[PDB]
Design a protein around this nucleic acid. Structure first.
Ligand SMILES: N[C@@H](Cc1c[nH]c2ccccc12)C(=O)O
Ligand SMILES: [Mg+2]
Ligand SMILES: [Mg+2]
Ligand SMILES: [Mg+2]
Ligand SMILES: [Mg+2]
Ligand SMILES: [Mg+2]
Ligand SMILES: [Mg+2]
Ligand SMILES: [Mg+2]
Ligand SMILES: [Mg+2]
Ligand SMILES: [Mg+2]
Ligand SMILES: [Mg+2]
Ligand SMILES: [Mg+2]
Ligand SMILES: [Mg+2]
Ligand SMILES: [Mg+2]
Ligand SMILES: [Mg+2]
Ligand SMILES: [Mg+2]
Ligand SMILES: [Mg+2]
Ligand SMILES: [Mg+2]
Ligand SMILES: [Mg+2]
Ligand SMILES: [Mg+2]
Ligand SMILES: [Mg+2]
Ligand SMILES: [Mg+2]
Ligand SMILES: [Mg+2]
Ligand SMILES: [Mg+2]
Ligand SMILES: [Mg+2]
Ligand SMILES: [Mg+2]
Ligand SMILES: [Mg+2]
Ligand SMILES: [Mg+2]
Ligand SMILES: [Mg+2]
Ligand SMILES: [Mg+2]
Ligand SMILES: [Mg+2]
Ligand SMILES: [Mg+2]
Ligand SMILES: [Mg+2]
Ligand SMILES: [Mg+2]
Ligand SMILES: [Mg+2]
Ligand SMILES: [Mg+2]
Ligand SMILES: [Mg+2]
Ligand SMILES: [Mg+2]
Ligand SMILES: [Mg+2]
Ligand SMILES: [Mg+2]
Lengths: 118, 17, 56, 123, 209, 114
RNA sequence: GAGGACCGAACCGACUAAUGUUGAAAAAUUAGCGGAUGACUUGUGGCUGGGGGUGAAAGGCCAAUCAAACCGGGAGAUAG
RNA sequence: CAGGUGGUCAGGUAGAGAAUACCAAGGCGCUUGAGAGAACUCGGGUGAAGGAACUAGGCAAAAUGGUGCCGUAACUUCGG
RNA sequence: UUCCUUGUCGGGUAAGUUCCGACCUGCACGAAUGGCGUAAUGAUGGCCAGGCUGUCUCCACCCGAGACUCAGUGAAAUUG
RNA sequence: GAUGUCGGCUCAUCACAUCCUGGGGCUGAAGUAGGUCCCAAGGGUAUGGCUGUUCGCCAUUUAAAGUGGUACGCGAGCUGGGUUUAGAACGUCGUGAGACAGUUCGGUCCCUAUCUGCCGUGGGCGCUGGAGAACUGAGGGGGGCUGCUCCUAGUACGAGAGGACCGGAGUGGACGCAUCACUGGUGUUCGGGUUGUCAUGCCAAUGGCACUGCCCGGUAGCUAAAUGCGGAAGAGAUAAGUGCUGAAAGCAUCUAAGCACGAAACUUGCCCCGAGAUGAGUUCUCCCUGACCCUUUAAGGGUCCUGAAGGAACGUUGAAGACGACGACGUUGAUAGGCCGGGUGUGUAAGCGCAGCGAUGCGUUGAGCUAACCGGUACUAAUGAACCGUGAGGCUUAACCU
């Protein structure tokens, strides 16, 4: 049974999921639109959107908390200097998923996930 | 090739001596 | 285990009566581009529901 | 939750120090004895000049368990170890004259009124 | 007597004045609207059909919507029936509330149990497992034997095997009614009833003693 | 669960004093010995608290007559007559289950003073 | 500063269990296990040949073959 | 092709160490992937109360585990 | 090494066809195809105890690799 | 040109020559408790010590610890202790090679399921216009066990000792169903402590790796050892048995005619499946009211116009689920994610200040962080469509209206 559990295992172990969504969180911040598989694009919303609400209030403690979760100072700098102020009046829902076709190599269903103002 | 390993084994083959 | 008698070409095509592929029925046309795409998917040139979502 | 092969301390001054449960009385395929349940035991260790000697087969009543007892409001009372009081095999009356440590109120039945009265405290 | 259709709100407890805590299930019984009455002449048996709850107008079909319109009732989330005992009579449009259980002492609650999916024989039928060690080969929770040799040469109907567990109708009988609360449409029964929270429940007075 | 919460508020006690793990507390519980109803006191160290509204509970451990006794009380049950804090203790944890293996001078809890 | 001494990696082995058994593998893998300055172990070259060799001896080994190797011949042995 | 294959080189921090953990120089991610999150199998983690009652048998697991000091019986071939 | 045989007596256990000590009625021990002892040693056989535990009572949950679905490639034993 | 062996495990299923529970007749049956026979197969019917053992002996229970069949049920379900390969030894036999239902120590157990069977779960067509619900119940399955205490009553019975039937009440054991409010387990998706090392320029603060590095707590969900419920009562027809009336046979006689009792067995009653029940049933509601041509003139074929109720597909997903299926929602919108407010868990964050030589302590401060929970909120994704499904539904007869 699986009743009322949340999250996708995505055929990885615990530490490899955590690293993978940390790398993909930075890639979406840096480029503002990336292409990934549809299950991975949906599980990304629950990682990247909590960072943008953390970045709405600029503080030394919030920056050290965004760093502990992104481990990239270029990403932390952009979150607090550009994205946070840019989304300051939006109440959640910072990303948008658009389904595209199927990956050629293995027929994976693909999607684009981007920030809403790009 | 050789015989299958269960067809060589005495325990499997020799069940009714 | 393995079969005792060779199955017939009729039993082989009865088993395959369920293996048929089904075609896509709903192919939508975009409101501005006027071209076809899968429903709820972006068009091949980057449109979705009238707006150019992807400058590729 | 006492079953066969459980070791129990003894809560009276009959002479036993440790006893082993060898049968949970009162039914076929019965598994566990809670507080206030009669069990058949054997004596594993005893003091040099007690009323009972090592290797005897007696009855006993469980008075304390680590599993504990439930109360009607949802409460629990747990102890640090399992203890029992030796009973005569035939009369089922206590062999010792003192009781050590508290007992609980499930011993409040006409059978075990001598245990309730000697106990230092009843929770 | 007839029963009523409710909804499982959850479990809680009731503390009594003498320090007993009664575990209760809370069942929300809104008013049940009578939508059709069946009689021996037209239908061959005596029963009432009731509806409850609400349904959004865009999700009720034309065949269903015209059924409610003839009864003069607002659409509910479903339809259920109850057999009428001799000497009970109802009328279309009449509403029935939880005060019907005011003097009832025990009830029977039927609902759909929680679905456990495809379950094995250890979970489904309490089969004993085999040894975990001592040489066992790939057979730790498997069912064991399923028949005898050449006589009868087959497996019997009703053999206990793994398969779909749960997600079926279950009736629990002889549950005490702890409190009927007509103002808030509640009924409190002692103990646990089948289903998940938010599931439909049919509550009826107990048939046994 | 608006329905459940307001069925729950009407039963909760309003006079529950504030206490935390490590505190020495004395709980007085109604005991019925035949016909008469009587109060009996249980004093010990709070080692665990569960905060769930009406389903709140707390565990007290005392050493009586040579053997430790742990009693789990339900906070809002009418068996519980009164709760009173005798001493405030200083601990870093929320559950003091490590006191189960310690005894005597090793089980001492420092007082809070503030 | 002795020792077919002691604990223990490389190195040499193979006591137990699980896996595998149309295998990843015609004998392995994982987790533990034994010896570990010696009657030790290993590279290169050499010698012993089939009723023969060699054997701290199990009828063991002698090219995945051993109570008598493999190849060719007698040979289309004989077969109630 | 999860096997076999002789020699030379031999950095840091902890360590007795060529063990073990994390790293350098350097080299790789093992030539099918994407989903889901049933039984059952495999490899592991934790477990109330009990504690060998399991079984052919404590098999397998769990436990013990270092250094310094105190202390250490029968028996003995006087070394253990 | 003893068939009768689970000999009999004692010990250990609540209960001991095994184990230990004895007796001798040795079917069918016995003196270099050695007898009787024996400290140390043994991946050696049997028995007991302490510690420890999912071995069990009686299983529950969790983490991964398969099993299941999708796209690609694509076997086998067997068979009137 | 192969039908694997004893015992154990797991899972069973039948018979009745009945071990318990149920109903009776006789007793050398006062009562309690028995003995013996008849009826009855609904349910139930031990845990351990020794031993490879089945068996047996023993210990302690139980209402009782049934007897048999099923390839002495069950190895394409497990084991491999015994037996029964190759090694080695003892006793004995043999000159010897060797032998011994004599003993002893060691010793490879393969199979990805085509068919039938069984357990679950769908697709097609049918049921005669199409569609959406709610039903009826032919038929099938599940369940059925029992102890002790108290009252009756120290009554009946008995010299005493002892000690009831019938009836009622309570509380257990084992088994089953559901559930998660409580007590708990888990909780590698939450918080914290801490060891070694590497990095983020360094300090401070963090992150990776070491089995989740090791540990300590713990949310939802799942769950038992947790806690609710169940086995019935009653009815019908009976078994053995007991009768009433009553001839044959002036009497007697339960039987021949007639009438009445009588058990956990049977049929119901209770729970669940169920119209593919092809004998394919019923009720309510919803929708479609156009032309034309042709031949082989018929339940005929085609063309144009039209496309209804509804369905599917797609999308957001679920206490539903292997996949199908099932449930909810798709802007006239709380379906999921985020966000906002709470709760819960952990246990007083970082920064800064103060005290101390320093580890460290104190203040700001029950702070900060907080998964799956609760109450809300259109911020993001759930699109205008298109697709399937038609256009009044055969013949004969009867009864009514014309
Ligand atoms: N069963 C094992 C060992 C084995 C190899 N050959 C055998 C011949 C007979 C018996 C066993 C074997 C295997 O197949 O790998
Ligand atoms: Mg995969
Ligand atoms: Mg890790
Ligand atoms: Mg194997
Ligand atoms: Mg296994
Ligand atoms: Mg047949
Ligand atoms: Mg040496
Ligand atoms: Mg060798
Ligand atoms: Mg190895
Ligand atoms: Mg060594
Ligand atoms: Mg030989
Ligand atoms: Mg060879
Ligand atoms: Mg010739
Ligand atoms: Mg020839
Ligand atoms: Mg290689
Ligand atoms: Mg080498
Ligand atoms: Mg190394
Ligand atoms: Mg898994
Ligand atoms: Mg445990
Ligand atoms: Mg424990
Ligand atoms: Mg044993
Ligand atoms: Mg071992
Ligand atoms: Mg002897
Ligand atoms: Mg001799
Ligand atoms: Mg001799
Ligand atoms: Mg001589
Ligand atoms: Mg001689
Ligand atoms: Mg494929
Ligand atoms: Mg053949
Ligand atoms: Mg009979
Ligand atoms: Mg057999
Ligand atoms: Mg078989
Ligand atoms: Mg053997
Ligand atoms: Mg031999
Ligand atoms: Mg023989
Ligand atoms: Mg096998
Ligand atoms: Mg029936
Ligand atoms: Mg807990
Ligand atoms: Mg944990
Ligand atoms: Mg630092």
């Amino acid at each position: 049974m699986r009743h009322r559990k949340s999250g996708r295992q995505l055929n990885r172990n615990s530490s490899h999921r955590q690293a993978m969504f940390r790398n993909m969180a930075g890639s979406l911040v840096r480029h503002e639109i990336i292409k990934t598989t549809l299950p991975k694009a949906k599980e990304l919303r629950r990682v990247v959107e909590p960072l943008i609400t953390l970045a709405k209030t600029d503080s030394v403690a919030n920056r050290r908390l965004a760093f502990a979760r992104t481990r990239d100072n270029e990403i932390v700098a952009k979150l607090f200097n550009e994205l946070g102020p840019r989304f300051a009046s939006r109440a959640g829902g910072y990303t948008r998923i658009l389904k595209c076709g199927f990956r050629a190599g293995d027929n994976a269903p693909m999607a684009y996930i981007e920030l809403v103002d790009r | 090739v050789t015989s299958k390993w269960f067809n060589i084994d005495n325990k499997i083959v020799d069940h009714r001596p | 285990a393995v079969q005792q008698n060779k199955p017939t070409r009729s039993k082989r095509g009865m088993r395959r009566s369920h293996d048929a592929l089904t075609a896509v029925t709903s192919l939508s046309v975009d409101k501005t581009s006027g071209e076809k795409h899968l429903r709820h998917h972006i068009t091949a040139d980057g449109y979705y529901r009238g707006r150019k979502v992807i400058a590729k | 939750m006492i079953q066969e092969q459980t070791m129990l301390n003894v809560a009276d001054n009959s002479g036993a120090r440790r006893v082993m449960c060898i049968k949970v009385l009162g039914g076929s395929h019965r598994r566990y004895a809670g507080v206030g349940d009669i069990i058949k035991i054997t004596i594993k260790e005893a003091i040099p000049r007690g009323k009972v000697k090592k290797g005897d087969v007696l009855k006993a009543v469980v008075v304390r368990t680590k599993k504990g007892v439930r109360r009607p409001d949802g409460s629990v009372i747990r102890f640090d170890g399992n203890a029992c009081v030796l009973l005569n095999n035939n009369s089922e009356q206590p062999i010792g004259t003192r009781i050590f440590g508290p007992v609980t109120r499930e011993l409040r039945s006409e059978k075990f009124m001598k245990i309730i009265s000697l106990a230092p405290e009843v929770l | 007597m007839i029963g009523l259709v409710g909804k499982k709100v959850g479990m809680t407890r009731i503390f009594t004045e003498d320090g007993v805590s009664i575990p209760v299930t809370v069942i929300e019984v809104e008013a049940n609207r009578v939508t059709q009455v069946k009689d021996l002449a037209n239908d061959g048996y005596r029963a009432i059909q009731v509806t409850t709850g609400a349904k959004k107008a865009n999700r009720v079909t034309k065949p269903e919507a015209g059924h409610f319109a003839k009864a003069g009732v607002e659409a509910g989330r479903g339809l259920w029936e109850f057999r009428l005992a001799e000497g009970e009579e109802f009328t279309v449009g009449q509403s029935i509330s939880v005060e019907l259980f005011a003097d009832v002492k025990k009830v029977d609650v039927t609902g759909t149990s929680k679905g456990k999916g495809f379950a094995g024989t250890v979970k489904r039928w309490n089969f004993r497992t085999q040894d975990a060690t001592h040489g066992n080969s790939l057979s730790h929770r498997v069912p064991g034997s399923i028949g005898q040799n050449q006589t009868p040469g087959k497996v019997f109907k009703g053999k206990k095997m793994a398969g779909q567990m749960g997600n079926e109708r279950v009736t629990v009988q002889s549950l005490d009614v702890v409190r009927v609360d007509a103002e808030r449409n509640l009924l409190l029964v002692k103990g646990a009833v089948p289903g998940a929270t938010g599931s439909d429940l049919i509550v009826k007075p107990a048939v046994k003693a | 669960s608006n329905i459940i919460k307001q069925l729950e508020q009407e039963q909760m006690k309003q006079d529950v004093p504030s206490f935390r793990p490590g505190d020495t507390v004395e709980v007085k519980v109604w005991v019925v010995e035949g016909s008469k109803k009587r109060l009996q006191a249980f004093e010990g160290v709070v080692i665990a608290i569960r905060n769930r509204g009406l389903h709140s509970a707390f565990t007290v451990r005392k050493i009586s007559n040579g053997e430790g006794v742990e009693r789990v009380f339900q906070t809002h049950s009418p068996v519980v007559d009164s709760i009173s804090v005798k001493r405030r203790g200083a601990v870093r944890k929320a559950k003091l289950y490590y006191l189960r293996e310690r005894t005597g001078k090793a089980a001492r809890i420092k007082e809070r003073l503030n």
